[PDB]
Design a protein around this ligand. Sequence first.
Ligand SMILES: *[C@@H]1O[C@H](CO)[C@@H](O[C@@H]2O[C@H](CO)[C@@H](O[C@@H]3O[C@H](CO)[C@@H](O)[C@H](O)[C@@H]3O)[C@H](O)[C@H]2NC(C)=O)[C@H](O)[C@H]1NC(C)=O
Ligand SMILES: *[C@@H]1O[C@H](CO)[C@@H](O[C@@H]2O[C@H](CO)[C@@H](O)[C@H](O)[C@H]2NC(C)=O)[C@H](O)[C@H]1NC(C)=O
Ligand SMILES: *[C@@H]1O[C@H](CO)[C@@H](O[C@@H]2O[C@H](CO)[C@@H](O)[C@H](O)[C@H]2NC(C)=O)[C@H](O)[C@H]1NC(C)=O
Ligand SMILES: O=C(O)[C@H](O)[C@@H](O)[C@H](O)[C@H](O)CO
Length: 389
Amino acid sequence: DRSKWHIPIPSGKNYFSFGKILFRNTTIFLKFDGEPCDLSLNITWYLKSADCYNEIYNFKAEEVELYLEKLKEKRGLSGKYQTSSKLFQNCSELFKTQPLQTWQDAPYIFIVHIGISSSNLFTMTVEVKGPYEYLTLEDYPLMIFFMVMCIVYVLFGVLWLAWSACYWRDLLRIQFWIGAVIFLGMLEKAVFYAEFQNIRYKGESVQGALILAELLSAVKRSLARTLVIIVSLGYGIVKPRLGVTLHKVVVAGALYLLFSGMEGVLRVTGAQTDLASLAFIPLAFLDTALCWWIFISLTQTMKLLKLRRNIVKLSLYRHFTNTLILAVAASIVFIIWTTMKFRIVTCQSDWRELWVDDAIWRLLFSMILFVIMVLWRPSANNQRFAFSP
Ligand SMILES: *[C@@H]1O[C@H](CO)[C@@H](O[C@@H]2O[C@H](CO)[C@@H](O[C@@H]3O[C@H](CO)[C@@H](O)[C@H](O)[C@@H]3O)[C@H](O)[C@H]2NC(C)=O)[C@H](O)[C@H]1NC(C)=O
Ligand SMILES: *[C@@H]1O[C@H](CO)[C@@H](O[C@@H]2O[C@H](CO)[C@@H](O)[C@H](O)[C@H]2NC(C)=O)[C@H](O)[C@H]1NC(C)=O
Ligand SMILES: *[C@@H]1O[C@H](CO)[C@@H](O[C@@H]2O[C@H](CO)[C@@H](O)[C@H](O)[C@H]2NC(C)=O)[C@H](O)[C@H]1NC(C)=O
Ligand SMILES: O=C(O)[C@H](O)[C@@H](O)[C@H](O)[C@H](O)CO
């Protein structure tokens, strides 16, 4: 996901190709540097538009040499293209013209080939610049989304801090970890925004910002799941804090984080080593099992509360269960819709809305967290949610 390319031309077949999605009226800059010239050069560049996104996704450089001829023979795909070629005696390195600008916003495939006629000799610098300095399309909406999420989490943290300050006299231990979750979200969104700003204004992504961000996301989700499990079991809320009730159970249930650590990082550093897609299923199955456990535990706790005729906590648990069930239903609907809208079409004819699959989950999590926070608002009578032996 870069925007600048440095390449030693005397390497392999010398073909340099890239498939991306660009804005409209975006220029491409080519520069050459190196040692003096003693031989003849031939340059040939092709720029092809895309009709539907599939070709970009499955574009393999290994067969470029064939793909080019596949475009010449007309058994490729529709879409107008611009081709050009030039000759240089020895170097003519101080060259101007190398028209070559985008005419319509859509997926693009760019290919450049160099033929030498008579060891590293030259070095090619390739840049792409649109209306924004280096922020190519497919990232602008994502950057806006991350900025908005940063603002929303800042507001959430401010509200939580104000509420805690206004009722600092007495607080609940379970009520403290909300602050930790908010802090983790703050760090995650800040890292996203900083990385995106750096990429836009420099053209190169951070060395390891994505890995740290994925680790933070996994940690936050694991903490949320463990807190939900503990609240559902009623540990410290309905039943007393028994010696070994979460011991070996709740903590032993944190291995979910590990499975999250083998998915987000992988997804980020896509390697496609036959394990990229496979890591997705087991995590979903584990989450389904966790929900299966949670609902049963929550039903048992509701029965126990009904037995002893407790009123205040009964309504709170009813609201909690309603919110959780609605969240689960919404998540299932969203997953089914994404699966039936993105991975069923012959080829994706709607390339605009592919960033939604990586943003909807965060928005849903933020909404659920906000609802949960609203449920547990600190107040003067902040002791009803205690065991009270
Ligand atoms: C290496 O590349 C350069 C640039 O493509 C070749 O051009 C050299 O630079 C001059 C500058 O114009 C070329 O024009 C010549 O100008 C002289 C007057 O100074 C004129 O009498 C010639 O008829 C010609 O128009 C010229 O072609 C050439 N000159 C020199 C001294 O190199 C250059 O030829 C290339 N060198 C090799 C070895 O291929
Ligand atoms: C395409 O983008 C370029 C660069 O953003 C535009 O170039 C500017 O055009 C306006 C009006 O045409 C000028 O006032 C500016 O001076 C130009 N920029 C520079 C750096 O000179 C261009 O107008 C856009 N449209 C087309 C059709 O090229
Ligand atoms: C520079 O490279 C291009 C790409 O191969 C050459 O274009 C071909 O050149 C010969 C001329 O007959 C044949 O392979 C084809 O007819 C050309 N392809 C076309 C016209 O699409 C080009 O000739 C090279 N420049 C030279 C040789 O000066
Ligand atoms: O992989 C993802 O994009 C998300 O982490 C989802 O898995 C949610 O966490 C979840 O399944 C609902 O709780």
